Amino acid sequence: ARAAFLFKTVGFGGLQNVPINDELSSHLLRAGNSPWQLTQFLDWISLGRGLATSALVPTAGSRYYQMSCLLSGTLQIPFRPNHRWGDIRFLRLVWSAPTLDGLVVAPPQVLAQPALQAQADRVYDCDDYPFLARDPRFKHRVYQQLSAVTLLNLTGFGPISYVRVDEDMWSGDVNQLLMNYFGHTFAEIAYTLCQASANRPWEHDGTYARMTQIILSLFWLSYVGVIHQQNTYRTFYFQCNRRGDAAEVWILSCSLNHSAQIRPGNRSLFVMPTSPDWNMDVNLILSSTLTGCLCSGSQLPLIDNNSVPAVSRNIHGWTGRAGNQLHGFQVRRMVTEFCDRLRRDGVMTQAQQNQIEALADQTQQFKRDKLEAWAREDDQYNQANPNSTMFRTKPFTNAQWGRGNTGATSAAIAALI
Amino acid sequence: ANVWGVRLADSLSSPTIETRTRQYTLHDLCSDLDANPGREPWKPLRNQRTNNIVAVQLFRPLQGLVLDTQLYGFPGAFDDWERFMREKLRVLKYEVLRIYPISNYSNEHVNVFVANALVGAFLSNQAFYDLLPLLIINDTMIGDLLGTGASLSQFFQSHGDVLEVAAGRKYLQMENYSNDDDDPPLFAKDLSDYAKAFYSDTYEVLDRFFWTHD
Amino acid sequence: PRCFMNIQLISPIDAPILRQWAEIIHRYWPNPSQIRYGAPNVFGSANLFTPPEVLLLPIDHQPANVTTPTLDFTNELTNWRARVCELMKNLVDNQRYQP
What we know:
- It is classed as virus like particle.
- The structure is cut from a larger assembly and holds chains A (417 residues), B (214 residues) and C (99 residues).
- Chain A has 417 residues and is mainly alpha-helical.
- Chain A is 39% helix and 4% strand.
- In chain B, strand 3 and strand 4 form a beta hairpin.
- Chain C has 99 residues and is mainly alpha-helical.
- Chain C has a two-stranded antiparallel sheet with strand order 1-2.
- Chain C is elongated and about 70 Å long.
- Chains B and C meet through loops of B and loops of C.
């Protein structure tokens, strides 16, 4: 499938250096030395029915964002034409391994030394350094999160699911494996998968590939509300009736009422949003998490160069010369279209969708306001902070509070049955 | 050019020219089992003092020698070895005839590696009159050699879609050897165990497999 | 000593015995192989001297050919005791053990 492995190092819209401050690492390295903080990252969700929030990190938006800033700073050292490990600070940072592991304070001499400079947009290959280049396995392991960084990094905007629908995803072992999780919350099986590859990413055309395909696909179908109690996908569909809020629990169900048919014809596409409120959502992060493994086990298609910023084009590992341009939206009009075509089916009443929209856009308002306020606070911080710099999250613009451009995309992603 | 102790070219002599390979068929098998007077498929080499034949290197397919010499049996005289050879050969000739008629067909593919397993079984003086249709290559010996699960685990052994063997023998030292200044070494390719190689048909899956192999 | 791995350091009639000894050994000392074990997702791995999920053996593994017991007498152990037995034989063939 894929024997080529690369990545890139983040750029900035105006910062002369890394904005990472040791404080972040510390409050994360309070335990251990890992470069990936997967465990409490995932557990920091507070079950996702609500979020975990702090001044240091109010959202896993912020969490993973600084995770990224950190690891961007981290990689600086060992990875050069002059590859190496040990005794050169990156804000007192030192690894302790030839496999480039362990993270502690610089030695006294190394505390005095100047830190390694950084550069922006520093794309590289993940196969140059020899040590890990001897162990395929830990290499793959790290790659599934190098990707999680990279993909979100490649765009001035958010994450993307590479949704794919294909028939062979029906098989005996398949529906077998399916059977394991009836009446099950998406999030928990996501956890199981994080496990079942963190141990070992399954092999290229693994059973579990087709599975997670089913998972994310049915997820997004319910997400748009594509399938439902009557429009059913081999009679399976998640639920979360509490719609209108920032937390959903979509769960497997079988409908013995009507079933919708899958015509032949394999299809797929690449979805992002256009509202930077996703910081309440998690499902995007897990989809990212798994799609990373999908890459690290299976060589996957690429997108058009024009689909991405010019400086970030023609990437062997990610940026091919063709591939379906992204698909953006905003959750507000997302649930709008969702409930609307649902009632189009006549399984509702009008006041239903209406009372949905009320609370939904109420929440939209409030939390956008909170977002912008925290932005102001961080600005004043920077003003007070000539030397201890940071961005809680990927900096944004109000220009990102409008059209989802999702209109025809509705029918597009809808015609994937 | 003088590397650490060696002094070599400073300009090339490397050609580019190559040819095409042989394909194997029935009368291929036959003639190879004919040991053509004058076109015999071996090269009996010698020392280099008085140049006395003391070894041979083989032209596969005649290989498949996998076990201890102490079961082989053959004289210390060159000619004697060859006549005993010719005898047993024409015997197994009559045999393979019994199995397949000379006119049953004309020419057709057969797994050479299989033929060499037969070589070894015969010379080993052990029975093989049970692995017989397995000779005939229908389309791809890979699936053919891999269809079976347990038989004669002493030539070949299958693990998954893999077959694992040591390739047929190439050299043989004879009974006049004396470790002379004129004795070029075969490098232990005549041993009853000096190597192991492994096939299915493809790189990647075994490249996977090796995380669980030395 | 060097001679301990150098059979050339003695004449094979000055001491034919030890010469054939080392020679035999170099040619026949038993051969090792390995095998897998268990299921990783339920057992894991503690093997760190070796690629994951491997299990060596000082011996070569030989599969069987039918579900019944097998009548086997070409074993490197069979052949092995045979080796040392004939070594004794050749030994006692000495001219000097019959006055």
